């Protein structure tokens, strides 16, 4: 065939899209216990009946959790048993032979899902597929109990029967490709934006103010994000696995939490800084020295380390359930699992306490601007819009993740993994936004031009 280019058309990548890969036992749309790539364990409502059938199939005590390797072997067995089921049947084999490669997979898909016996019950639709009446079979199949239970999956399989191509599955890979370049643009923006801020402050003797000393720290935290955290996370998602062993998996995870903490806590420190800088400028200038500020920065990074490298390297963050035990053992797994204790304690430090202070402080600013020595004019609206961007961008990017992070702790299975990762990535892009928020000063503006000779 000479084909090693992506998206070869077959039943394996087709079902992987319809079924998905889930290592721990779950319930399908009907309520039956399924595991791996669409493997029906049992129809018994008991979870212990499910586990007993699973242990019998795998050959060991699994505790409801199998490995990737075990999941794939179950997959191929289930596919081969579907193909063997088709060739053994008297209604499936005549139709199966007379189908093309693409429409053979569409049949296997149905058999794989609702069994050999069930599929052979489609007398009319099989009669149409045999006589090559694809569009009638397509209309007809859409009138079944199968179409009402899993419509999204049925439409794809029906479309595969009608068109005879992989159109309904072809697009799925394009979106992975589009995803990959966007990640690149994120990394680029975070790196370029923050390397600029740090250079501007280090090089120009005039951006050497206390507030900028906090900006530098925020810019440093965002810098390590786009260099270490964001790219490695991108590769982890794109390649579906982790190829740097267990040590760098928890080292990377440590850098993740470290920089997110140091970033948000600095945003908090900046808000407080600007409160005193604005409300009481004479006390602010005399009390807050550059040495005192460099101590504040150290402490923010120390707290950050305490909530990142310390619990993680000492494995205190670790969960105890079987799926977490297996992933910790697997050199190619780096999924994130924590206990209630850590996920709550880290969230309060990394996000919630900074959030509260920032909401409080920025309120005290707006509220104290009303009670100064003073028409409802222009300058106040533009100022209110500024903190609306300052506080709005922070909230919109990090709040949805840390809420969901908590909800996943309270009630398990409530948040699908895809969402938890997307919302985490919406938090990552805040590192790109910050240089557009905290560096609009006329001094930054001038420095930015001279640095790149515009």
């Amino acid at each position, epitope marked *: 065939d000479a084909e090693n280019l992506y998206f070869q058309g077959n039943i394996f990548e087709m079902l992987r899209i319809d079924e998905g890969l889930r290592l721990k036992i779950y319930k399908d749309t009907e309520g039956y216990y399924t595991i791996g790539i669409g493997h029906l364990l049992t129809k018994s409502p008991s979870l212990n009946a499910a586990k007993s059938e699973l242990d019998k199939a795998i050959g060991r005590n699994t505790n409801g959790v199998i490995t990737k390797d075990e999941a794939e072997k179950l997959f191929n067995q289930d596919v081969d048993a579907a193909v063997r089921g088709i060739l053994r049947n008297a209604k499936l084999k005549p139709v199966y032979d007379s189908l093309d490669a693409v429409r053979r997979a569409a049949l296997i898909n149905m058999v794989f899902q609702m069994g050999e016996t069930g599929v052979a019950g489609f007398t009319n639709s099989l009669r149409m597929l045999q006589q090559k009446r694809w569009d009638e079979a397509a209309v007809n199949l859409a009138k079944s109990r199968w179409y009402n239970q899993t419509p999204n999956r049925a439409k794809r399989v029906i479309t595969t029967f009608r068109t005879g191509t992989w159109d309904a599955y072809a697009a799925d890979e394009v979106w992975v490709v589009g995803m990959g370049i966007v990640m690149s643009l994120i990394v680029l923006a975070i790196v370029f934006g923050n390397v600029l801020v740090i250079t501007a402050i280090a090089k120009f003797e005039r951006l050497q103010t206390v507030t900028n000393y906090f900006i530098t720290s925020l810019a440093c935290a965002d810098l390590v994000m786009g260099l270490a955290v964001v790219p490695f996370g991108a590769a982890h998602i794109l390649t579906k696995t982790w190829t740097f062993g267990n040590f760098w998996c928890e080292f990377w995870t440590s850098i993740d939490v470290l920089c997110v903490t140091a970033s948000i806590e600095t945003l908090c420190v900046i808000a407080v800084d600007r409160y005193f800088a604005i409300t009481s400028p*004479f006390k602010y200038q005399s009390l807050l020295t550059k040495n005192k500020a460099r101590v504040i920065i150290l402490m923010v990074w120390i707290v950050s380390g305490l909530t990142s490298f310390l619990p993680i390297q000492m494995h205190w963050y670790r969960a105890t359930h079987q799926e977490a035990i297996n992933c910790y053992a697997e050199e190619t797994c780096c999924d994130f699992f924590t206990n209630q204790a850590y996920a709550i304690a880290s969230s309060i430090v990394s996000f919630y306490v900074p959030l509260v202070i920032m909401v409080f402080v920025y309120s005290r600013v707006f509220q104290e601007a009303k009670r*100064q020595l*003073q028409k409802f004019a222009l300058k106040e609206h533009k100022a209110l819009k500024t903190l609306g961007i300052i506080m709005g961008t922070f909230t919109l990017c990090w709040l949805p993740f840390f809420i969901v992070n908590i909800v996943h702790v309270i009630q398990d299975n409530l948040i699908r993994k895809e969402v938890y990762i997307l919302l985490n990535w919406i938090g990552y892009v805040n590192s790109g936004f910050n240089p557009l928020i905290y560096c609009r000063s*006329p001094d930054f503006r001038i420095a930015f031009q001279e640095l790149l000779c515009l």
Partner: nanobody, 120 residues
């Protein structure tokens, strides 16, 4: 796009009194620092007296006890009282406003400048 009108300067005898005055024409943020800076002959620009929108003040260590800054009700006008004038107070006095519209940084508005000459 606001303006700063300065007035009050001129010639004055040693030990004489003088009253600078600056009015801010335009819309300035409710939180700001309105004050005066000066450039002595052949010396750098130095803060003289400043006043926060919240009332509090600040002075250079060479004008404390002699110079006093105050402001108006809502007209945003600032008056600088300069008593016991010395020859080292001979300079160019600029009226300044630090507007905190952006929160993160501060926007400076300057005055045109007014000369003050003390007869040594």
């Amino acid at each position: 796009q606001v303006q700063l009108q300065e007035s009050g300067g001129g010639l004055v005898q040693a030990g004489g009194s003088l009253r600078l005055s600056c009015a801010a024409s335009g819309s300035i943020f409710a939180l700001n620092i309105m004050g005066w800076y000066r450039q002595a002959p052949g010396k750098q620009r130095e803060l003289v007296a400043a006043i926060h929108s919240g009332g509090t003040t600040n002075y250079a260590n060479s004008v404390k006890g002699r110079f006093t800054i105050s402001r108006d009700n809502a007209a945003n006008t600032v008056y600088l009282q300069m008593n016991s004038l010395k020859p080292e107070d001979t300079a160019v006095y600029y009226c300044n406003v630090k507007d905190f519209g952006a929160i993160i940084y501060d926007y400076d508005y300057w005055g045109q400048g007014t000369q003050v000459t003390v007869s040594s």
